[PDB]
């Protein structure tokens, strides 16, 4: 297991524009197009992202290209953020994947708001962080996904993603 397989499990793959769990226009492997409620806005963003007149449909190769760029962007956002870098740097490789997952889903600013949970992660208080992380809009809105990520922070293993 690695970060790409993990997110592919959590986001799926759809080759036509769809709405994500919050109602926003999305494509591929969780690539957010726009928060605007206009489908025309979303098709404009898609065509700009891909570089061609797509008419709301992309290929599997195009989806995996956006995915590679989004994973790279999530990692670089972590390493540039002063609140996130020291936590990431303190973690083992499996738990680092959990941190990238959260940044991919909710963005760098959103994760840096989990101030208490980040401190507990840095101190390697795993059971305590896991409790604090579940006291969140994130957990109540997407509880199966949040459970898998939290389990990964708590155990440092991939057990939540095996079987799936
Ligand atoms: Cl969920």
GROMACS .gro file of C-alpha atoms and ligand atoms in nm:
model
  165
    1UNK     CA    1   0.000   0.000   0.000
    2UNK     CA    2   0.112   0.362  -0.065
    3UNK     CA    3  -0.049   0.709  -0.076
    4UNK     CA    4  -0.174   0.672  -0.438
    5UNK     CA    5  -0.354   0.341  -0.373
    6UNK     CA    6  -0.490   0.480  -0.042
    7UNK     CA    7  -0.647   0.789  -0.201
    8UNK     CA    8  -0.774   0.588  -0.496
    9UNK     CA    9  -0.964   0.381  -0.243
   10UNK     CA   10  -1.098   0.685  -0.066
   11UNK     CA   11  -1.185   0.901  -0.370
   12UNK     CA   12  -1.269   0.653  -0.641
   13UNK     CA   13  -1.238   0.722  -1.012
   14UNK     CA   14  -1.508   0.888  -1.224
   15UNK     CA   15  -1.442   1.011  -1.578
   16UNK     CA   16  -1.739   1.247  -1.604
   17UNK     CA   17  -1.808   1.556  -1.392
   18UNK     CA   18  -1.987   1.463  -1.064
   19UNK     CA   19  -2.068   1.627  -0.733
   20UNK     CA   20  -1.856   1.539  -0.431
   21UNK     CA   21  -1.994   1.474  -0.081
   22UNK     CA   22  -2.037   1.847  -0.030
   23UNK     CA   23  -2.211   1.907  -0.361
   24UNK     CA   24  -1.916   2.056  -0.549
   25UNK     CA   25  -1.824   1.979  -0.908
   26UNK     CA   26  -1.538   1.730  -0.922
   27UNK     CA   27  -1.376   1.486  -1.169
   28UNK     CA   28  -1.124   1.207  -1.179
   29UNK     CA   29  -0.981   1.093  -0.846
   30UNK     CA   30  -1.125   1.360  -0.624
   31UNK     CA   31  -1.005   1.658  -0.829
   32UNK     CA   32  -1.220   1.957  -0.719
   33UNK     CA   33  -1.307   2.178  -1.019
   34UNK     CA   34  -1.503   2.460  -0.853
   35UNK     CA   35  -1.726   2.550  -0.558
   36UNK     CA   36  -1.950   2.747  -0.793
   37UNK     CA   37  -2.295   2.599  -0.854
   38UNK     CA   38  -2.260   2.654  -1.227
   39UNK     CA   39  -2.191   2.350  -1.434
   40UNK     CA   40  -2.065   2.580  -1.709
   41UNK     CA   41  -1.806   2.723  -1.473
   42UNK     CA   42  -1.700   2.364  -1.392
   43UNK     CA   43  -1.659   2.266  -1.757
   44UNK     CA   44  -1.449   2.580  -1.810
   45UNK     CA   45  -1.221   2.485  -1.520
   46UNK     CA   46  -1.193   2.130  -1.655
   47UNK     CA   47  -1.091   2.242  -1.999
   48UNK     CA   48  -0.831   2.481  -1.853
   49UNK     CA   49  -0.692   2.199  -1.630
   50UNK     CA   50  -0.662   1.947  -1.914
   51UNK     CA   51  -0.577   2.175  -2.200
   52UNK     CA   52  -0.845   2.078  -2.451
   53UNK     CA   53  -1.216   2.110  -2.516
   54UNK     CA   54  -1.336   1.823  -2.306
   55UNK     CA   55  -1.712   1.859  -2.284
   56UNK     CA   56  -1.717   1.722  -1.929
   57UNK     CA   57  -1.546   1.391  -2.005
   58UNK     CA   58  -1.181   1.293  -1.961
   59UNK     CA   59  -0.981   0.979  -2.014
   60UNK     CA   60  -0.821   0.754  -1.749
   61UNK     CA   61  -0.479   0.887  -1.839
   62UNK     CA   62  -0.593   1.246  -1.796
   63UNK     CA   63  -0.747   1.157  -1.456
   64UNK     CA   64  -0.420   1.002  -1.340
   65UNK     CA   65  -0.222   1.304  -1.454
   66UNK     CA   66  -0.440   1.540  -1.245
   67UNK     CA   67  -0.404   1.288  -0.958
   68UNK     CA   68  -0.023   1.289  -0.975
   69UNK     CA   69  -0.026   1.671  -0.975
   70UNK     CA   70  -0.266   1.687  -0.678
   71UNK     CA   71  -0.064   1.442  -0.465
   72UNK     CA   72   0.254   1.643  -0.543
   73UNK     CA   73   0.080   1.966  -0.455
   74UNK     CA   74  -0.049   1.825  -0.127
   75UNK     CA   75   0.307   1.716  -0.025
   76UNK     CA   76   0.460   2.055  -0.117
   77UNK     CA   77   0.181   2.240   0.067
   78UNK     CA   78   0.264   2.041   0.381
   79UNK     CA   79   0.637   2.114   0.353
   80UNK     CA   80   0.576   2.486   0.301
   81UNK     CA   81   0.335   2.527   0.588
   82UNK     CA   82   0.500   2.620   0.916
   83UNK     CA   83   0.232   2.453   1.124
   84UNK     CA   84   0.233   2.131   0.921
   85UNK     CA   85   0.599   2.066   0.836
   86UNK     CA   86   0.727   1.989   1.191
   87UNK     CA   87   0.441   1.742   1.241
   88UNK     CA   88   0.501   1.569   0.907
   89UNK     CA   89   0.876   1.557   0.974
   90UNK     CA   90   0.814   1.388   1.308
   91UNK     CA   91   0.602   1.104   1.165
   92UNK     CA   92   0.686   0.762   1.023
   93UNK     CA   93   0.614   0.690   0.658
   94UNK     CA   94   0.266   0.530   0.705
   95UNK     CA   95   0.138   0.810   0.923
   96UNK     CA   96   0.279   1.063   0.675
   97UNK     CA   97   0.038   0.911   0.419
   98UNK     CA   98  -0.250   0.978   0.659
   99UNK     CA   99  -0.149   1.345   0.682
  100UNK     CA  100  -0.131   1.376   0.302
  101UNK     CA  101  -0.480   1.217   0.275
  102UNK     CA  102  -0.627   1.478   0.506
  103UNK     CA  103  -0.460   1.768   0.315
  104UNK     CA  104  -0.581   1.625  -0.016
  105UNK     CA  105  -0.941   1.615   0.109
  106UNK     CA  106  -0.973   1.934   0.309
  107UNK     CA  107  -0.672   2.148   0.203
  108UNK     CA  108  -0.368   2.281   0.387
  109UNK     CA  109  -0.552   2.555   0.575
  110UNK     CA  110  -0.818   2.320   0.696
  111UNK     CA  111  -0.576   2.067   0.841
  112UNK     CA  112  -0.364   2.339   1.009
  113UNK     CA  113  -0.685   2.425   1.201
  114UNK     CA  114  -0.665   2.087   1.384
  115UNK     CA  115  -0.422   2.253   1.629
  116UNK     CA  116  -0.481   2.026   1.927
  117UNK     CA  117  -0.472   1.703   1.724
  118UNK     CA  118  -0.148   1.807   1.552
  119UNK     CA  119   0.023   1.864   1.889
  120UNK     CA  120  -0.082   1.520   2.007
  121UNK     CA  121   0.053   1.364   1.685
  122UNK     CA  122   0.387   1.538   1.730
  123UNK     CA  123   0.404   1.404   2.086
  124UNK     CA  124   0.317   1.053   1.957
  125UNK     CA  125   0.002   1.035   2.179
  126UNK     CA  126  -0.181   0.814   1.923
  127UNK     CA  127  -0.494   0.713   2.120
  128UNK     CA  128  -0.545   1.068   2.235
  129UNK     CA  129  -0.502   1.217   1.888
  130UNK     CA  130  -0.747   0.962   1.750
  131UNK     CA  131  -1.016   1.073   1.998
  132UNK     CA  132  -0.949   1.445   1.934
  133UNK     CA  133  -0.958   1.398   1.554
  134UNK     CA  134  -1.308   1.241   1.568
  135UNK     CA  135  -1.448   1.554   1.739
  136UNK     CA  136  -1.480   1.725   1.404
  137UNK     CA  137  -1.716   1.817   1.129
  138UNK     CA  138  -1.491   1.599   0.907
  139UNK     CA  139  -1.565   1.283   1.108
  140UNK     CA  140  -1.940   1.349   1.131
  141UNK     CA  141  -1.974   1.427   0.760
  142UNK     CA  142  -1.751   1.151   0.612
  143UNK     CA  143  -1.728   0.897   0.899
  144UNK     CA  144  -1.610   0.585   0.708
  145UNK     CA  145  -1.326   0.773   0.542
  146UNK     CA  146  -1.235   0.960   0.861
  147UNK     CA  147  -1.228   0.629   1.053
  148UNK     CA  148  -0.982   0.475   0.806
  149UNK     CA  149  -0.746   0.777   0.826
  150UNK     CA  150  -0.774   0.797   1.205
  151UNK     CA  151  -0.703   0.424   1.232
  152UNK     CA  152  -0.393   0.477   1.027
  153UNK     CA  153  -0.275   0.756   1.262
  154UNK     CA  154  -0.357   0.545   1.566
  155UNK     CA  155  -0.183   0.219   1.457
  156UNK     CA  156   0.082   0.317   1.204
  157UNK     CA  157  -0.032   0.027   0.983
  158UNK     CA  158  -0.241  -0.010   0.666
  159UNK     CA  159  -0.491  -0.244   0.830
  160UNK     CA  160  -0.790  -0.014   0.763
  161UNK     CA  161  -0.722  -0.031   0.384
  162UNK     CA  162  -0.656  -0.404   0.354
  163UNK     CA  163  -0.964  -0.605   0.266
  164UNK     CA  164  -1.086  -0.307   0.058
  165LIG    CL1  165  -1.740   0.833   0.445
   0.00000   0.00000   0.00000
